[PDB]
């Protein structure tokens, strides 16, 4: 009957008493009745005691079941990788509708490269436009407007100043590999980029078919 | 939920945290300097300290999440107000450009 | 062994002195602890970049340090340290950038958001027809959500408002400091009508929407013929644009053609 | 399943630190374990300080947002003045 007396008897002092009750229950190794006789703090202390006892057999499992009254790993990994660090770039074209629409409507206006650079940066920031797709759309608008060449060349030089030099090579390689399995405009763009030394001949040459 | 805001509002929590850390340091120094009954008492107090630390960490994480959520809500409200002000400024600029 | 922690705290407080006084992984761990502690001292009481550079030149830790600092320093030294990291040129960088993006409001930090994304890429009274306004911006809401164009009443209302708005577009016949997002001006309502670039926005959105729809998830044959006819009318409208209407149309055609290639999801 | 996974949200780091401490203690070379426990406790102290600093930063951000809202009210007043000018 000593256990019943100890239970009936019993925020520094309150926390100390709760920890002492948890330690006594752990040293017990029927208690559910006394636990329900008296709270949310009690439930939290019971959960902490169960966690510690699991950290510290069949008897423990039975006590946990009484007090209750593999793929999960990959699922949690996927959930955390998506929530915490997601690329979230809105790559293709149609995800960000307003974004690419306003981008192309800004590139196709009547014809200062710094102002357009700042506008494109603001659009990237506001609509989360992927940078590589922005460069691709810029290269294509440069294809279809072969009159204003030096303007887009200064824009391409300033943009690639803030990106990796091998982005243009791989993007041109993608735009050429698309037609492998080739209009004159595509060759004209690569020739202009190669002339002004924006990209090296090695990467583009490797990307070609023959 | 009001209890969490009350406990967060009213440095004393960090002082009690560091004081319990000093208690746990004294207990592990006692074990390193050191009978089965004293070892069991000591281990029970160490486990109680660990549980207290776990509860404090959970409370702090929940409070940080709530604070970040409130800050995000305030940021959204400020962004909406700024978008309204930007629409007004765009209207004024376009009216000055047409006139 | 904590004597080694005290020795590290002492010899860490320019670079050659700590480099010589250091003359094994547990010692490095205690040194990283001392680094974090002195960083906490500095942030409570810039030089943080100096210490991170010292540790980097000593070489792990510095990514954790930058993460903690960016979690602490709210706005300005955060910008300075981000520029510093830009000058410095793994997953911790992604975590920091994502937390920054989640903290920014995109209201006045837009250029900063653009810089962050570019770095991430470098890594790897007057009679007002309020009903017409309702119709136009409900069309805009349709633009925002493409999946809404599969139910019955949704598609029906979309068709109704689209026909009315394009009829107004064709009947207008114009024949003639930066706003990144749309401006729903209920008192102006008209200066956007006079802008040809506004009409270009609208019609290019239309074209991208129809291109995605042509690429469950099925349509009615009559609806598809409607899509084709409206595409033709949209091209007609784009041709009416005084500044190089046909050149702009051909440019958009090449764009949406390349769009088909991009839709091949070149994951390989 | 998904609800508990979301409520798990850092928290994993503190949970793993507490778990490693409990495991080492149950195992209790003893000086090395005590020093590892001291390292873990110092890391937990740094984490608590970081949480306090994050709370202070959230408070300062709320204050700055209130200041920006006052500034936006002033900008709306300036917009009314610019409407008179218009």
Residue numbers in the entry:
A (entry chain B): 14 to 23, 39 to 57, 72 to 80, 83 to 100, 107 to 119, 142 to 183, 188 to 257, 262 to 290
B (entry chain E): 38 to 47, 52 to 75, 80 to 144
C (entry chain A): 10 to 22, 29 to 38, 44 to 65, 71 to 84, 91 to 120, 133 to 167, 227 to 278, 296 to 334, ...
D (entry chain G): 6 to 14, 23 to 41, 45 to 102
Which statements did the authors publish about this structure?
The mRNPs are then recognized by the conserved and essential transcription-export complex (TREX), which requires its DExD-box ATPase subunit UAP56 (yeast Sub2) and the mRNA export adapter ALYREF (yeast Yra1). TREX subsequently licenses loading of the mRNA export factor, NXF1—NXT1, onto these mRNPs, which enables their nuclear export.
The 28-subunit TREX core comprised the tetrameric 24-subunit THO complex (THOC1, -2, -3, -5, -6, -7) and four copies of UAP567,28. The human TREX core THO–UAP56 complex forms a tetramer and comprises two asymmetric dimers, 1 and 2, that each contain two seven-subunit monomers A and B28. We improved monomer A densities from 4.6 to 3.5 Å resolution (maps D, E), from which we derived an updated and near-complete model of the entire 28-subunit THO–UAP56 complex. We newly built structures of the THOC1 C-terminus and THOC3 subunit, and updated THOC2 ‘anchor’, ‘bow’, MIF4G, and ‘stern’ domains. The contacts of UAP56 RecA1 and RecA2 lobes with the THOC2 ‘stern’ and ‘MIF4G’ domains, respectively, can explain how THO stimulates UAP56 ATPase activity, by promoting UAP56 opening.
